[PDB]
Amino acid sequence: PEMVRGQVFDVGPRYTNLSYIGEGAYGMVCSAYDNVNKVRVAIKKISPFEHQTYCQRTLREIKILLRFRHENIIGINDIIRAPTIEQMKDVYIVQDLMETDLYKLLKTQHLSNDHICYFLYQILRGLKYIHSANVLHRDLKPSNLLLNTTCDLKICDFGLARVADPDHDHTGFLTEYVATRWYRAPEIMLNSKGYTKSIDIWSVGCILAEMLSNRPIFPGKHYLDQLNHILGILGSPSQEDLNCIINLKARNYLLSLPHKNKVPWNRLFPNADSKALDLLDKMLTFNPHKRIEVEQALAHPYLEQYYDPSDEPIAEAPFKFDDLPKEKLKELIFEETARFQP
Numbered sequence: 001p002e003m004v005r006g007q008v009f010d011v012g013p014r015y016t017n018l019s020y021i022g023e024g025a026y027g028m029v030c031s032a033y034d035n036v037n038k039v040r041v042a043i044k045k046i047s048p049f050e051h052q053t054y055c056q057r058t059l060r061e062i063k064i065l066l067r068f069r070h071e072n073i074i075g076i077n078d079i080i081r082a083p084t085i086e087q088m089k090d091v092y093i094v095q096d097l098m099e100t101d102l103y104k105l106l107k108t109q110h111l112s113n114d115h116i117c118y119f120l121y122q123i124l125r126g127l128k129y130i131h132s133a134n135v136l137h138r139d140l141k142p143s144n145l146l147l148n149t150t151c152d153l154k155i156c157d158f159g160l161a162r163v164a165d166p167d168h169d170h171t172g173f174l175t176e177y178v179a180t181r182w183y184r185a186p187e188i189m190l191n192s193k194g195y196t197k198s199i200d201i202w203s204v205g206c207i208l209a210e211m212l213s214n215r216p217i218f219p220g221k222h223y224l225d226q227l228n229h230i231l232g233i234l235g236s237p238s239q240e241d242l243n244c245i246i247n248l249k250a251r252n253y254l255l256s257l258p259h260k261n262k263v264p265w266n267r268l269f270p271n272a273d274s275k276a277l278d279l280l281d282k283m284l285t286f287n288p289h290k291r292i293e294v295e296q297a298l299a300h301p302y303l304e305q306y307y308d309p310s311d312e313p314i315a316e317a318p319f320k321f322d323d324l325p326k327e328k329l330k331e332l333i334f335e336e337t338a339r340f341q342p
């Protein structure tokens with residue numbers, strides 16, 4: 001078997017000529033020549049079976065992405081594993097290989113308004129489909145938006161994704177949360193478990209602001225610092241928005257802060273298109289009930305050149321399927337990956 005940077009890659013025979021790409025908690029990723037389709041692909045080796053939280057991320061990633069089929073959502077092309085549960089130590093997930101991601105692009109490149117518009121359109125078109133299946137991505141951020149050489153965009157990493165559950169959304173003040181800090185809606189720190197579609201729209205709002213200036217809009221260094229960066233720009237919540245926060249610890253925290261005025265978007269973003277800033281404002285609304293929805297966002301005048309609801313598909317049916325053990329999640333992973341065996 002091939003090795004890459006001191007790791008076995010048991011992807012053959014089909015997948016050969018393996019170049020390293022990168023690495024994280026998830027595992028390792030390489031490009032590989034796919035000998036059946038005659039194209040290089042991404043393959044990420046997951047070795048999750050000794051941690052039930054990595055097994056959860058693996059099952060979510062595989063189950064959701066095999067159900068979903070959409071031009072702006074990364075697919076799974078193939079999955080490699082051993083022929084039995086016992087011999088299965090790794091899972092290789094094969095996906096279309098993409099040139100870069102929006103994180104890398106923003107650290108190096110100025111985006112034209114035309115590029116910003118097209119990226120935003122694609123994010124929302126993928127998100128329309130995600131949300132139509134009653135799913136929340138819950139970790140939208142520039143590194144989870146893959147880009148090819150002609151700026152086609154695909155949303156990736158569904159390991160935190162959930163079915164939406166807005167009747168179980170309420171929680172207490174300062175409840176801990178897993179998704180990336182800078183893209184967390186203000187309600188996460190106040191009274192929300194992050195089980196509504198409006199969580200994803202906030203993150204998209206954050207991404208949009210970041211495309212306008214190549215800097216994160218709300219770069220909090222710790223849990224509550226994130227709300228204070230948010231309130232620094234949006235200003236103090238209105239009476240009406242506060243009355244919606246019935247939790248007293250959260251309410252009284254907000255009432256304790258000195259009055260802060262709204263920083264106008266056109267002063268933060270002097271070179272931005274005014275329609276982009278109108279849509280930004282609606283995505284970065286403090287009150288999640290007042291926040292724009294994905295379909296309204298698509299219909300916003302900023303995206304008029306692209307908007308076409310007939311060419312913005314939805315899922316044919318809602319998605320469905322939990323503190324289960326590592327060993328049962330392994331079984332589920334084995335069942336879900338069977339279609340790729342000879």
Ligand SMILES: O=C(CN1Cc2ccc(-c3nc(NC4CCOCC4)ncc3Cl)cc2C1=O)N[C@@]1(CO)CCc2ccccc21
Pocket residue numbers: 021025026029042044046048053054055057058061074095096097098099100101104146156157158159160
């Ligand atoms: O799966 C991920 C996250 N990952 C990691 C990852 C690397 C690579 C690419 C990729 N990259 C390029 N191209 C790159 C060229 C260089 O520039 C950047 C772009 N093309 C195509 C692809 Cl699918 C995509 C991903 C991705 O979704 N986590 C998961 C799910 O939460 C799995 C299972 C698991 C277990 C524990 C914890 C996390 C996770």
